[PDB]
Design a protein around this ligand. Structure first.
Ligand SMILES: [Mg+2]
Lengths: 769, 65
């Protein structure tokens, strides 16, 4: 092995912001890098656009005054147009049309308003950088000397419209001995049976014609030329719509940058409405995923092909992350780690405190995107109590005097064995005696009173379809619940250096974030950062990817490498690679399926890598995302709260990436100021009223404003606006196709002088119109 | 059912026979009546479900034509 690509699985997220570096974001390459960064701009700002324009006006001024005095005309027009390299951001004529209708300041002002209509407040694209690392096992990024060149290739596809309905995760009925991600109890006791699933777009018959339902494109860029190349397909493939699946550029140092599409979903007819959460015929979106390879050409003639599955990479595109600094409690990098573990080996797992802190830390931070974790979570309140007395470090104590404290917390978490809080129906059905989540199909018979408390966390899960099944609700996976169980029993290790930085949960998080920043394994951190912001459960189907990712069968390699720090694990770093069909879009299995339906029996038959059904795991382009909802906006609109007859806690699906209850800019502007602020308006009050009231009442008002959380579905018009509006679930799905780009985007923001109010110095604020 | 009134060729052929008082040829098992019996028989769907199909990429799938 000579050279490798990192990350092994790259992620790029759709956005209506442009595909240029100054106005786009980059997938995290180091976990926890910017959790408290109050300068983040995830939407396109006026200042960014203004900056971008003067850089085009940075020359131009000499040239326009030269025909200023030579007096517009249609090619006065074009000489002005040509020198502002802006035709890659807005169409030709929109620029010209805005000029023929009307002093340098009035071409700027006219042009600025064009970029502002297109891009102001636009959801920035989250692009993925890919790097070549020299090997011995990675040591260092490839460094091009003159004469050296790298050539990247990327082939992507979308098969959602070709694939099968998503009713629930087929692996729920897969016979297994159990993994780190999924206990054998689910299948063996039939807690959430996999359903059969029919074909999407079932009126397209014969494999030959169904090939039209698959969108695909490809392209190559080298280090000799940084011109951006689009990845443009057609639906249906070869009336007919172009689909920008992404774009790719490569800089002189050899870094590939991959931009996802614009977020465009569309039906073939306007009357075809996306009223189901996942399976809507006649629809296509611009989500893709596919195979990333490269070729390295040194000047001494030598050439190294980066093509095999150990060395090359994959890219998937996904919905946007509406709260980039709020991390899911269980992440896709956790599914990778769990997949390499066998359930009956968890007794040999060793536990440091840095392996359980992510669970408590991520759950604690869910308060900014989900009401239940802000006002109805007894463990997050216990953490606040410890913070308020600088006594968070007792959670790091593994001795007997702290066992009552650890155990009290651990006992509130749901056991992924799904064998607690159940009455066994006369032996063999497992029926929960905790709070169930009813079906919308009501039955006017008295509910059975619950006898056991509702465990944590309060999120729905793979088995939602089945009222009373313990798998309705989410549990941290087997290996992560094992870490938490060892912690509660005392069987864990932790360093004095950790203890000294552990007076509050924020201080320890900052400390651990520094351990990531200085760990010398950039190739493996980049591989883990790509996946640590993605969700890892529940899968119904989820947000970015779904249940195949939690099986080792999808990886050609999955190995523990090292801890993050020699003394600090932090759930570790791994070297993993997806299984790949090396023929790519030319694979003979590109267009394979299981006939009229897919069922767990097909999955069972795919376990054997020699069998005829093993292609399921050997990915061709489009295989990772084809499972998800078509269009994704129907999925996102479906991904919110699931109300129970009991008001609280409100259950939520995936609040860390698709938030449910957020803190809007409106409220931020009403608590961010102090009473002493030198502003004519203070927290939405006149100066005089703000400073006339007592300090007690002022801070109280701040805290009340801070406490107001707004349904995220209400941050744009999803069908509830206007007199007599219907609103409702279905209109949400329909409207999200256009409104996804207007939904609130959560960003860290400062509170310089919280005083006595109880508002932290960093708050997470939802920005929308 | 309308299709059996105005769109069923076998009902119509029965009509033709009835109109000539010639329905008894259907009870003829001889060779001279074979074409007539076959003509009605070949219009019926076969419950083997293996006619009027194209085998898609034989794993094999039966797709009606
Ligand atoms: Mg997030």
């Amino acid at each position: 092995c000579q050279y490798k690509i990192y990350p092994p699985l790259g992620i790029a997220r759709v956005g209506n912001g442009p595909a240029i570096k100054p106005l786009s974001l980059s997938t995290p390459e180091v976990p926890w890098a910017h959790l408290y960064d109050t300068n983040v701009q995830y939407l396109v700002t006026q200042q960014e656009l203004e900056q971008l324009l003067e850089e085009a006006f940075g020359n131009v001024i000499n040239e326009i005054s030269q025909i200023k005095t030579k007096l517009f005309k249609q090619e006065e027009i074009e000489t002005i147009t040509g020198l502002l390299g802006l035709s890659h951001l807005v169409p030709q004529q929109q620029l010209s049309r805005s000029l023929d209708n009307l002093i340098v300041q009035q071409i700027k002002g006219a042009l600025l308003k064009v970029l502002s209509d297109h891009y102001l407040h636009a959801v920035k694209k989250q692009a993925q950088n890919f790097y070549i690392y020299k090997c011995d096992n990675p040591v260092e990024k490839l460094k091009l000397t003159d004469g050296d060149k790298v050539t990247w290739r990327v082939e992507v596809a979308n098969k959602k419209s070709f694939w099968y309905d998503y009713n629930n995760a087929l692996d729920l009925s897969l016979h297994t001995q159990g993994s780190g991600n999924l206990s054998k109890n689910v299948s063996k006791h039939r807690l959430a049976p996999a359903m059969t699933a029919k074909r999407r777009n079932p009126n397209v018959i014969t494999n030959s014609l169904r090939k039209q339902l698959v969108i695909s494109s490809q392209g190559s860029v080298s280090s000799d030329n940084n011109t951006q190349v689009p990845l443009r397909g057609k639906f249906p493939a070869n009336e007919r719509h172009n689909v920008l699946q992404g774009s790719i550029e490569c800089d002189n140092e050899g870094v590939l940058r991959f931009y996802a599409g614009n977020g465009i979903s569309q039906a073939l007819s306007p009357s075809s409405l996306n009223t189901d959460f996942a399976d809507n015929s006649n629809w296509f979106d611009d989500i893709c995923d596919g195979r990333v390879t490269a070729v390295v050409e040194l000047k001494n003639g030598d050439t190294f092909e980066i093509q095999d599955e150990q060395s090359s990479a994959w890219v998937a595109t996904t919905p946007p992350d509406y709260a980039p600094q709020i991390e899911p409690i269980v992440t896709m990098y956790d599914m990778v780690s769990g997949a390499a573990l066998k359930e009956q080996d968890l007794d040999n797992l060793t536990t440091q405190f840095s392996d359980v802190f992510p669970i408590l830390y991520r759950l604690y931070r869910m308060q900014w995107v989900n009401q239940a974790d802000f006002t109805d979570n007894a463990v997050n309140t216990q953490i606040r109590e410890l913070n308020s007395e600088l006594g968070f470090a007792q959670l790091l104590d593994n001795s007997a005097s702290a066992k009552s404290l650890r155990e009290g917390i651990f006992n509130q978490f749901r056991n992924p064995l799904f064998d607690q809080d159940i009455d066994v129906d006369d032996p063999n059905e497992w029926v929960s005696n905790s709070r169930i989540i009813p079906s919308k199909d009501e039955t006017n018979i008295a509910a059975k009173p619950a006898t056991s408390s509702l465990k944590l966390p309060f999120y729905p899960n793979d088995g939602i379809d089945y009222p009373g099944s313990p798998v309705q609700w989410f549990a941290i996976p087997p290996f992560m619940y094992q870490h938490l169980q060892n912690w509660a029993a005392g069987d864990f290790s932790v360093t004095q250096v950790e203890k000294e930085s552990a007076n509050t949960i924020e201080e320890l998080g900052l400390f651990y974030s520094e351990q990531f920043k200085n760990s010398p394994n950039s190739a493996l951190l980049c591989a883990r950062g790509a996946l640590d912001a993605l969700y890892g459960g529940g899968f119904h189907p989820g947000v970015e990817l779904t249940w195949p990712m939690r099986h080792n069968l999808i990886y050609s390699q999955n190995d523990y490498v090292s801890s993050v720090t020699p003394e600090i694990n932090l759930l570790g770093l791994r070297e993993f690679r997806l299984k790949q069909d090396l023929q790519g879009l030319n694979s003979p299995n590109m267009y394979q399926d299981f006939g009229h339906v897919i069922a767990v029996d097909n999955v069972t038959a795919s376990i054997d890598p020699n069998s005829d059904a093993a292609w399921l795991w050997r990915s061709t382009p489009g295989d990772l995302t084809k499972w998800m909802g078509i269009p994704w906006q129907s999925d996102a609109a479906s991904c919110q709260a699931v109300y129970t007859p009991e008001d609280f806690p409100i259950p939520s699906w995936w609040a860390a990436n698709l938030p449910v209850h957020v803190l809007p800019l409106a409220r931020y502007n009403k608590f961010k100021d102090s009473q002493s602020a030198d502003l004519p308006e203070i927290n939405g009050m006149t100066h005089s009223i703000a400073q006339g009231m007592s300090e007690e009442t002022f801070e109280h008002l701040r805290l009340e404003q801070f406490s107001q959380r707004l349904d995220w579905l209400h941050t744009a018009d999803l069908g509830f606006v206007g007199y007599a509006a219907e609103g409702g679930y279905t209109n949400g799905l329909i409207q999200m196709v256009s409104q996804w780009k207007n939904m609130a985007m959560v960003m860290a923001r400062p509170v310089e002088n919280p005083g006595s109010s109880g508002i932290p110095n960093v708050v997470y604020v939802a920005y929308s119109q | 059912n309308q299709a059996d009134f105005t769109d069923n060729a076998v009902n119509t052929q029965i009509r033709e026979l009835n109109s000539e008082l010639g329905f008894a040829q259907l009870l003829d098992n001889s060779a001279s009546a074979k074409s007539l019996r076959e003509g009605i028989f070949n219009q019926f769907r076969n419950p083997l479900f293996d006619q009027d199909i194209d085998v898609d990429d034989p794993s094999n799938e039966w797709v009606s034509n």
